[PDB]
Amino acid sequence: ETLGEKWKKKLNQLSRKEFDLYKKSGITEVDRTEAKEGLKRGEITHHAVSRGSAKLQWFVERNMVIPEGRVIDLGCGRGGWSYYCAGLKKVTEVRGYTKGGPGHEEPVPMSTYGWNIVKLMSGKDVFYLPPEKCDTLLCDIGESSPSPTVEESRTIRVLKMVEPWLKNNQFCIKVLNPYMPTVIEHLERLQRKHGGMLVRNPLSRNSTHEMYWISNGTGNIVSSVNMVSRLLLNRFTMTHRRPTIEKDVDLGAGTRHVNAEPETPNMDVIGERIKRIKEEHSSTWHYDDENPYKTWAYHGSYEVKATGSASSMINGVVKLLTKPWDVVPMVTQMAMTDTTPFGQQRVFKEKVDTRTPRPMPGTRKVMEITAEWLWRTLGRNKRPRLCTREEFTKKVRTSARAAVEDEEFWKLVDRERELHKLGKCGSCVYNMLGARYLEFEALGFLNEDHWFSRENSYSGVEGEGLHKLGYILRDISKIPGGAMYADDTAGWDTRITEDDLHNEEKITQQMDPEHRQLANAIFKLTYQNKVVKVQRPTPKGTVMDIISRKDQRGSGQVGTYGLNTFTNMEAQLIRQMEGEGVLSKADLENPHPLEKKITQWLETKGVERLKRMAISGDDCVVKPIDDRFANALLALNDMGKVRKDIPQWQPSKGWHDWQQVPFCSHHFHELIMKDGRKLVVPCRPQDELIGRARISQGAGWSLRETACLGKAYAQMWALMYFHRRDLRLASNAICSAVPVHWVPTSRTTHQWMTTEDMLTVWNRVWIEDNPWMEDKTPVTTWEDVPYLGKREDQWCGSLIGLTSRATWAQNILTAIQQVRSLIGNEEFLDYMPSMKRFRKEEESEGAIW
Ligand SMILES: Nc1ncnc2c1ncn2[C@@H]1O[C@H](CSCC[C@H](N)C(=O)O)[C@@H](O)[C@H]1O
Ligand SMILES: [Zn+2]
Ligand SMILES: [Zn+2]
């Protein structure tokens, strides 16, 4: 009797209760909550039809199987494997086959990225199908059964059927019952003939002993099978082991054309940079032929060491205080950020590795026209200038702070600067410093002189602040016209065309020859051409790939916020023209459109249209003259700026209430104080704020560093989200647990980064320095500081009314004392009497006994 047979007997003895717990015991699975809800509501993009997609992902990213050419998916079912293979590089065609009908899953039509090459066919029994020419053979067919003898026959029948399909090509077939003796005989027979290796997938549940025969690998079958049996028999002991949860795969959307997909880069610009990297790492420099890069130019690779973590460090301070939110899924999801080399490749493929189609000649014309009009308007007063070393140093001080004191660092800059003056680049490489200074030296004037301030840009909101954004949107709502629209763009930086960059290049026309020659270098050598390093796992280890592309946008740049704000202002303007009827479908296709009607529209109506918008980076809020703006989608899509989570040809939905308008990941409320005065406060789903608070940027932070981080978020809540009952209570709880004298430190210098009394700060922010507050009468206590409506608060994710929150908020005194005990004998202060409940529980309970 084999080892596998002993496992089956134990599996059958388990009750239905014991079976369900052991099934997902210690395994790995993906969060299908958002996916299943989406498919239920009829969402056709970004989603995977089943868990098979991520199940097949585990093999590909480890190079166990590399799907090439025609891909045949025997037993596609829902089509989990097919839609995933569609988004792969070396795949040219995907064909699916499933029996379907009653009792069997039917193929689910999707519009994910690469759907156009996917061909799913129902009513196909693979056992009666003659083999076809394919460079990749996939099979996930196998039905489990309590009797191992039954699984034995079902496994062998599949093996005999998938055999003629394998002709020195990539493959990945599912083996239902690998532990049966007669099955192994066939496996060993097929191993000597087609090679490969049998591998167990961690995403497979413990209820099945299924293993997958991959093409790329080697090893002993008999040993590997028994190791799986020993594992499943070992997991019988420990059952309550929580399954490792991972993020599901984003299959994106849109059609895929393999012919016009690859990248044709320029070399004489970036070649010097590549050469220096190659010579530095000439020890292990090589060219990986199986690179997954599609729309990016692959140059080479070299061996490195692993960098990054699968999970993020949890701020223990706030976690001990936000106990009721330990059961909330949304809060947990925000700490599941994967930064491992495996994750870097997963993130790259799903969002970074895409190509935006070249805009129509007519559209390219209007974009150029509006750009020159916009730059001339932005520079009506301010003149472009060169930033200084003194400015750079001052902002750095307010390691990295030690690198500026090193004189050798500044001389390296000069050597790189003179190259830029010669139209050459050598050391400017982006990662997933000296280059950043050179950009600041040229384009830093946009932020320092505040080019995108509302006083100068009419639409921009740079330097205003979060607490003033709400008042801005309220003023916009007063402007007559249609509803307020606010569409978010899916991956803005990945949708910047080459035409968009050339329009941003026109700013150099207002610069001095010595400034212009340096600025054009930054645009041409660092923006319109760039080299990025990115980690990638290989069967030999971790390597660093060198890629390049001549468009899109670098996330970590100096002019990231600026240029995105500029182009977005341009993008929304064109859409209004389409809405008003200025630009027609013919005009966008016409390479020679009359600029008379466009210029006249900009010279006359152009100013007011800018006053109807509030734009910050990719986020934008537009209140057009009418609701024709909603159906204006021809130009917005042709520019490559496709909206997120919505069909490309579906009219946008606007709001006539400014309180429901989303902007900068926030909505705003207008509440009424006890004195009758009105305030406009920022707001967002409560699970997000707590989710951000329970994470800690970086790892290996001491208790003090985590406590100082906690106090920062705490005072942030007390200043911005005071209107929330749960957050204000948590804020005072943290401040009570965190030592008073300890200075809050984190990656900021906002208005909550001080040691002053927050009450006095609140009066300075919302009363003193508030231009929308005519009555400067100060507020003497937090009890006069208004909350949201209980109905309003609960809808925003509050937990008020629940037993868990009720138990917490009243037993908060214990958790605070617990934190204080861990810190030690230091000086604290009770922030709980700041609110009414504990103040009445101190004037009563205190005076009684
Ligand atoms: N004889 C047969 N011929 C073709 N398909 C069959 C078959 N017997 C079963 N199937 C199909 O095989 C599929 C196995 S489940 C497929 C899951 C797939 N990998 C995904 O990720 O969606 C079932 O959907 C079943 O309908
Ligand atoms: Zn350079
Ligand atoms: Zn709200």
Author numbering: 7 to 404, 420 to 453, 478 to 794, 801 to 900
Copy out sentences from the published article reporting this entry, exactly as the authors wrote them.
NS5, the largest NS protein at 103 kDa, consists of an N-terminal methyltransferase (MTase) domain possessing three activities necessary for cap synthesis (guanylyltransferase, guanine-N7-methyltransferase, and nucleoside-2’O-methyltransferase) and a C-terminal RNA-dependent RNA polymerase (RdRp) domain that carries out de novo RNA synthesis. The MTase (residues 1–262) adopts the SAM-dependent methyltransferase fold composed of four helices surrounding a central 7-stranded β-sheet, similar to previously determined flavivirus MTase structures. The C-terminal RdRp (residues 273–900) adopts the canonical right hand polymerase fold, consisting of fingers, palm, and thumb subdomains. We have determined the crystal structure of dengue virus NS5 and show that the NS5 dimer is likely the biological assembly of NS5, and RNA synthesis and RNA capping may be coordinated by the dimer.
The crystallographic ASU contains eight copies of full-length DENV3 NS5, in which four sets of dimers (AB, CD, EF, and GH) are arranged in a saddle-like shape. Thus the relative arrangement of MTase and RdRp domains within a monomer and the arrangement of monomers within a dimer are conserved in all eight molecules. The NS5 construct used to solve the crystal structure (NS5-Δ6) contained a six-residue deletion (795WSIHAH800) in this priming loop, which was rationally designed to eliminate the need for this movement. This protein has higher polymerase activity than the wild-type (WT) protein when a subgenomic RNA is used as a template. Although no SAM or S-adenosyl-L-homocysteine (SAH, a byproduct of the methyltransferase reaction) were added during purification or crystallization, SAH is clearly visible in the electron density in the active site. In the current structure, the linker is well ordered, and has complete density connecting the MTase and RdRp domains. The linker is in an extended conformation and makes extensive interactions with each domain. The MTase interacts mainly with the fingers subdomain of the RdRp, and buries ~1000 Å2 of surface area as calculated by the program PISA. The periphery of the core MTase domain in one NS5 molecule interacts with the base of the palm subdomain in the second NS5 molecule, and buries 1100–1200 Å2 of surface area between monomers in each pair. Because of the arrangement of dimers within the 8 copies of NS5 in the ASU, there is a second type of dimer interaction (type II dimer) only observed between monomers A and F, and between D and G.
